[PDB]
């Protein structure tokens, strides 16, 4: 019923779970395969970049959140909501939230709590769609995400 | 030696440390104790009170300074100087500065830069002693600090 939610949860789960694994899963996507695949490739490029850049900071930031298991996931949701408290919504904040999520995902594997990775992807997807759906439709969903992060090719 | 420095550093470094580490320490002091312990206890009382009273404002003020690493520590030194720029000095201004330092120390913990905390304590200890040593020894140092913020009922 919410094609946007399904596609969002699909892309975010795929990125997070594979960041946790330490290897990439390239298997075909559910519905619109091309768009989602392109979004997963883009998210890989930008997301890995964000993580390499703020790795040290993310380490301490998550440490303070004190995530031990699934019951601490809603603490992450409060942080995600707080990211949009000043009214400003953009792709930079969105991809950073996802990138931090992938960082939380790796930590979850480190403390043997890989089961919480799906509720992690769900809450990240929930915040984006429940509170910022109008914005996402206006930005053409994941087509706009790919477009936003598209980089010049030097012909 | 600057006897006032080892004591001041010890007090300010201990406060910032336990504020950052989240749990207060208990170890005995250096020279003899007594005063330094009384100063730290007083600093806990007033300092935590200041923070709770101005936590919201501290959050944005620190955010603007954009402290990411040990290089940005120098930026804080200029903030400390501006506090006493109008020639005015009192115990309220000193404890507020150290209180802001403790708030900064928590931030350094949050972004995994705990190695900047001790340099931060040194920079704070620097400003007070460098430009306001005369004033400090005239107010009986940390004994005066304790005396000012004394409030006891009984």
């Amino acid at each position: 019923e919410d094609e946007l939610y399904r596609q969002s949860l699909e892309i975010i789960s795929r990125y997070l779970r594979e960041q946790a694994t330490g290897a990439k899963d390239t298997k075909p996507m559910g519905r619109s395969g091309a768009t989602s695949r392109k979004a997963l490739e883009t998210l890989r490029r930008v997301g890995d970049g964000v993580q390499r850049n703020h790795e040290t900071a993310f380490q301490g930031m998550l440490r303070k959140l004190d995530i031990k298991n699934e019951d601490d996931v809603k603490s992450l949701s409060r942080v995600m909501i707080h990211v949009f408290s000043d009214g400003v919504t953009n792709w930079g904040r969105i991809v950073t939230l996802i990138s931090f999520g992938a960082f939380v995902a790796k930590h979850l594997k480190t403390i043997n709590q890989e089961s919480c990775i799906e509720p992690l992807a769900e809450s990240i997807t929930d915040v984006l769609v429940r509170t910022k759906r109008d914005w996402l439709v206006k930005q053409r969903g994941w087509d706009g995400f790919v477009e936003f992060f598209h980089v010049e090719d030097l012909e | 030696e600057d006897e006032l420095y080892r004591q001041s550093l010890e007090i300010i470094s201990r406060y910032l440390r336990e504020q950052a580490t989240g749990a207060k320490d208990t170890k005995p002091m250096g020279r003899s104790g007594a005063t330094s312990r009384k100063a730290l206890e007083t600093l806990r009382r007033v300092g935590d009170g200041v923070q709770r009273n101005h936590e919201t404002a501290f959050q944005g003020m620190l955010r603007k300074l954009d402290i990411k690493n040990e290089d940005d520590v120098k930026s804080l030194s200029r903030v400390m100087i501006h506090v006493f720029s109008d020639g005015v000095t009192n115990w309220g201004r000193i404890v507020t500065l150290i209180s802001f330092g403790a708030f900064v120390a928590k931030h350094l913990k949050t972004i995994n830069q705990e190695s900047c905390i001790e340099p931060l304590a040194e920079s704070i200890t620097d400003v007070l002693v460098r430009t306001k040593r005369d004033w400090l020894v005239k107010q009986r140092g940390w004994d005066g600090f304790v005396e000012f913020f004394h409030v006891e009922d009984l």
Binding site: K64, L65, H82, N90, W91, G92, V151 | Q59, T110
Partner: peptide, 24 residues
Amino acid sequence: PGVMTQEVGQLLQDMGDDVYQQYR
């Protein structure tokens, strides 16, 4: 139990805004 909600939140905001304009 995390009382760090606003703190970590604002940290991510500034980082996100830097990712913005890097790609804008």
